[model samples]
Target: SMVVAVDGPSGTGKSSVAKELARQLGASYLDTGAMYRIVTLWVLRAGVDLTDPAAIAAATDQVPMSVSSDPDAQTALLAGEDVSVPIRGNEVTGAVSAVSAVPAVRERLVRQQRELAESSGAVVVEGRDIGTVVLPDADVKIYLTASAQARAQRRNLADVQRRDHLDSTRAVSPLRPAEDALEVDTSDMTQEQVVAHLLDLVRTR
Candidate 1:
């Protein structure tokens, strides 16, 4: 199995493109943003005190999660519950990022994610830090970025920058391009063209 790490900021079309590549390659896929969202879910579900770092770390001491590595159908099994849809709901989007800053909360979870990918016959793991942290030496590391025009067009790119500022500065699995990563930009391209280009990245990998 080949581990392909795809990392990007929000609205860079990372999810759509990465999932499509995994589908084309018959690889398992996971959006680690989903994993963190679910971690937020579990933390809030347990009534963990967000302000207390110890509580946040202890409460989030472990992230017990499992899912099928198949890319065709998405699944996230957390604490024995199927929260695939809940993790994507608006509530997750609404949580404060202070809790998102916990390293232990993310550290153990990252380890588990690697194990999942290594076990799967094939997997494409996509998230903010996949390239820089999760799978640094992946078979093919791709860092996706879009033009400010497209990002702003999506939703006032400044807001994307504002939040991304909080994102990278969080200090927990900080985001960045690895020393060697293929940077893919398709802001000016249509969906068909974008799809074709990324498919080529996967095929050549």
Candidate 2:
């Protein structure tokens, strides 16, 4: 099975598009961003010092993180506990960057992500660095983008509706596109359009 790497900044419809594409292709959807959020959530809960690399690395090893996305519910699990909700909280959003920025943290999670991809075929994996870092050899690579204002608006909406908005730009892995990726400006496209376009790209590839 081949993998599709979808890399993009926040609110480019990466999650929504990747999920739908995975469903259509009969592939598993791996939300790599959620993995970072889980780490951030743990940092907040454990009251660890994000600025201390050694402490952050130790804390990451102690926490057990897993992700599950049903057609109906997408969730993150930490330490055998369901933290899908809390990880998306405002506070976690604010601190996730600091925790995720640590080289040690990204190294650990990248290894886990690579292992999962190597074991599974036909997965739609979304993250900021998937194309450039995690799955450079992926069969299909897509770099999704949108106007910053549009992304910001979407974040605000999430914050207002579900309090799930975080300053993604301020995070350690501030969202950006990989240069060699197929750039898709989703600012004017509907989710369905984005999904259809990506499916065509995958099928043609």
Among the numbered candidates, top TM-score falls to: 1
Candidate 1 on 137-169: residue-level lDDT in tens? Answer: 788888888766787786535777777677668
Q: Would you list the C-alpha lDDT of every candidate in the order shown? A: 0.76, 0.80
Whole-model alpha-carbon lDDT for candidate 2: 0.80
TM-scores, in order shown?
0.87, 0.86
- Cα deviation at 173, candidate 1, in Å, is 3.7
Give the per-residue lDDT of model 2 (tens digit) for 52-167.
98888887775688776442367788878888788878898789778887888899889989988877666888887898888888889998887766776766544432322343
Off by over 4 Å in 2: 69-73, 157-176
Candidate RMSDs in order: 2.3, 4.2
